[model samples]
Target: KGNFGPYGGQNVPEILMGALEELEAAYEGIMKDESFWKEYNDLLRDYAGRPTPLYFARRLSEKYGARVYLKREDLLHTGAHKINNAIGQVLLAKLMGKTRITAGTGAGQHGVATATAAALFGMECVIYMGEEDTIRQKLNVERMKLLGAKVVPVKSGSRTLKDAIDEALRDWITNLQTTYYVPGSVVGPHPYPIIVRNFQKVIGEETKKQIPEKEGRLPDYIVACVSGGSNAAGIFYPFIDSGVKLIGVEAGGEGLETGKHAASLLKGKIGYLHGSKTFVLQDDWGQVQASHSVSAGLDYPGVGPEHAYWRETGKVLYDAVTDEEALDAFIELSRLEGIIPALESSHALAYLKKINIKGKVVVVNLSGRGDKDLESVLNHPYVRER
Candidate 1:
């Protein structure tokens, strides 16, 4: 019944509906009470680190001819924006009396963060990750291991984000009653996109207060990288009706024309994938196409259903940043600002190169730190020579 304009709904088999509905009910009731909200807010500040800084990038602003503001989600405890939703969902799982938790990871950020939350709440956890992504984000795999979560490297279905989702969904069905799948992003069935986005809504809500206080006015453009669109949704939602330009950048691996990229909304068709109707990279017959990106996090074939609605209504300007361009951004931000951005976040920064931001105030959400991406960035040919 909860669909984002014919985009998000319960497309999974009927076997999982009980759990989904139960979760839907819990979310609806628990979120209304202040007790849960207080605990979540306390944990965010004392444990996960909340109210991340909105730093004005002096050099970036000077060089780009626009005022550059960076939302420092990279400074969070898990070094990414993933923890915000992880903590909220894990708390929800605990409240719902789930003893075991499961999730899928693309770059391992969500897996690590979910595992971290499970460790906090004494929940047994399992993370399904694509084999190829396990290789790309090996450091985060280790973090999950240290956090006492089991990581199963999925070997089929292009061995990427959607494959991990496939495995998690199948496993959820196998033990549907006892397991809680903490959706990593906003791409799952009904109530998931709604639930996860609210957890992440703090990003935009905080930015709303922080920006005007610092910049003396709202930003002219707010930019974020969109994989499954969690961070973008978080930061863009509060500003949707505020007249600030919202721009989302996706991975353009080799190039969009080269067909190796992962621009699901920019270069994808509306199709079914991972229990939602959204823009998915699929062939003529609807077989999901393989997505490629140097950044493990952004290498996905589908995007969140809410992003589809945003795209349809033109609430956000979505574009693709090529791998080479993102790598260049990785180096540029590091050199200029001393902030090494996660490759996933580098996409948003890279978009600055394409946009006409002259004399405008632009805010880019740095979704994560670059520590997990050092190996991949250092190994890329673009970074190798430079």
Candidate 2:
């Protein structure tokens, strides 16, 4: 299965080609392994923190006049939804007998998650992060260090997530004999998308049980933010077969019309970026251009395979929430609900005002907290006075 008919193929380097095929086979086996599933679910519940509460936002619901529920991913260990997949994959890596772990990050969510998992498993972990991102997400840098991980600041190219991914790929290629590339999202080759999605599907599964128990019925709509799209994919997966309405809010860095945004589904041209073949913001020569977004997590130009699939299949309604709108919502939520959301999650929260649903119930995936982004928010002129 491919997303937008653009993903799911051999997009890795030659050295990884054979390994990817082997990984695909092994991942399939892990998926069907009853013991593996049981262990993964158990650890997710006990170790990494699963069944994160589906919290009802009283302030948001009262102010917006719609039943708004926030999935408490911020409460999870490592403080973001990223841990869900990292823990699962680290377990898989151990199962596969991988010696070391390699990963890339932008907002540092994924790197932090992977590093946490590596530390938990007592494995060597190296994280690649863009130079600019390392400066902004310094707390996450320290977080990785605290977790006994090596953080390599990637300076080549734009020094962002995509570039970090390139660096990770190089590392994997050099150490392919023992290294396993832990892509932070669901955008990599076949097994990656499928496996990561399965780990994230817990979002939808939890919501399915919580909504009815909390509100006495299924929700009318679901909302999630899209960066590499794994979080959105996880929240959207269970709803795919149901009649539940779904929406994915992508980052509109500045404005889509200004040609300076990272709203991949809205403005990206179908082309190559990083490792996968998907929609990207590129030049006529197919070079990845500079992406602008206030949110570090959503600054990437490419998305996960499941997102590409959701967009193409018309299963999830996708929309763009600009940087300004996302920040505005971030402030609003902080002041109203006492929840300071990551700029990435704010993108989805911002769009709640746009929809005209009188009696509909909406769930927002608060992917992470904004504590790590305090410096950026304080230094920026827009949020300085606030």
Top lDDT model: 1
lDDT by residue for model 1 (153-180), tens: 9999789888898898888888777789
Residue-level error in angstroms, candidate 2, position 187: 0.8
Model 2 Cα lDDT, one tens digit per residue, 220-241: 8899998788888888898895
- Candidate 2's C-alpha runs over 4 A off are 1-6
The list of candidate 1 runs beyond 4 A from truth reads none
- Clash pairs of candidate 1? none
Worst lDDT run of 10 residues, candidate 2, spans 1-10
Q: Candidate 2: global Cα-lDDT?
A: 0.85
Relative to the unseen true structure, what is the C-alpha lDDT of residue 287 in candidate 1, on a scale of 0 to 100? 77
